[PDB]
């Protein structure tokens, strides 16, 4: 129920060191015999990148603040170049969420 | 002696024409108007979709 991608055949990596976490003065952690860093690659962040790309759109539609950048010698074509790249990403993060489905329609059984 | 002398002007009077009034006061017409224009205005979208 901690959902991995459906396609996943393998999806963990391990690493182990003897040194524990260390206390710094002024610090905020408790002193402990053991610890874990974790890095997770996941499809979920992509919706938070739609939040930011919608926060881009809503200003760009108003050319809000745009002049601060054109005068620096880059274009309004250079916003849309970088904007079109966020769309290729949004649309590929969708693709790596896919349940290995590559079909076109849907199909049904016998019910009453 | 006559007490009003001849040394004095005795210029005899003339046919002066009739007297016109001092002022005409002819009727006035109102001046024309059209209505006042708004100075602060409605504006379109500078930016499209």
């Amino acid at each position: 129920s901690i959902q991995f991608v459906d396609w996943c055949p393998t999806g963990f990596k391990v690493g182990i060191n003897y040194q524990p976490p260390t206390v710094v003065p002024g610090g905020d952690l408790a002193k402990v015999q053991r610890a874990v860093c974790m890095l997770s690659n996941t499809t979920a962040i992509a919706e938070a990148w739609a939040r930011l790309d919608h926060k881009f759109d809503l200003m760009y539609a108003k050319r809000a603040f745009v002049h601060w950048y054109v005068g620096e010698g880059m274009e309004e074509g250079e916003f849309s170049e970088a904007r079109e790249d966020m769309a290729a990403l949004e649309k590929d993060y969708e693709e790596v969420g896919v349940d290995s489905v590559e079909g076109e329609g849907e199909e049904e059984g016998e019910e009453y | 002696s006559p007490g009003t002398p001849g040394s004095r002007s005795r210029t005899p009077s003339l046919p002066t024409p009739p007297t016109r009034e001092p002022k005409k006061v002819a009727v006035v017409r109102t001046p024309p108007k059209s209505p006042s224009s708004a100075k602060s205005r409605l504006q379109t979208a500078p930016v499209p979709m």
Side-chain angles (χ1 to χ4, degrees):
Chain A
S1 61
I2 311 180
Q3 186 65 59
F4 265 65
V5 295
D6 195 274
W7 44 267
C8 189
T10 49
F12 301 96
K13 170 57 175 188
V14 299
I16 318 174
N17 200 266
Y18 305 117
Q19 294 310 303
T22 304
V23 290
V24 72
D28 298 301
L29 293 175
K31 192 182 305 197
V32 287
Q33 294 176 290
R34 58 202 85 75
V36 199
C37 257
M38 178 167 100
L39 304 65
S40 322
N41 202 336
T42 175
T43 77
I45 212 169
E47 300 192 283
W49 293 46
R51 184 196 309 123
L52 197 75
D53 83 46
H54 192 219
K55 290 176 58 177
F56 184 118
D57 302 326
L58 275 172
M59 302 184 184
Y60 208 66
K62 285 279 189 307
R63 288 301 192 286
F65 308 87
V66 193
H67 71 279
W68 281 126
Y69 300 79
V70 170
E72 306 306 319
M74 65 148 287
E75 298 198 292
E76 284 176 86
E78 300 180 89
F79 274 78
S80 282
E81 271 286 85
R83 183 50 183 104
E84 191 176 25
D85 212 51
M86 298 321 96
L89 188 63
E90 176 158 62
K91 292 189 191 300
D92 194 74
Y93 250 132
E94 189 180 281
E95 216 171 288
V96 302
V98 183
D99 289 356
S100 294
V101 172
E102 69 202 33
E104 283 182 308
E106 165 64 302
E107 188 156 284
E108 287 184 270
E110 187 173 69
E111 180 181 294
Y112 206 101
Chain B
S1 297
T4 309
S7 56
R8 283 178 165 263
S9 281
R10 292 184 186 62
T11 305
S13 305
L14 298 199
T16 305
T19 277
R20 290 302 307 247
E21 71 300 336
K23 299 179 58 187
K24 288 192 187 174
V25 211
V27 296
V28 303
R29 54 186 304 98
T30 179
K33 205 188 187 179
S34 294
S36 261
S37 295
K39 200 170 284 176
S40 282
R41 75 177 198 279
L42 177 56
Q43 309 187 245
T44 52
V47 192
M49 92 281 157

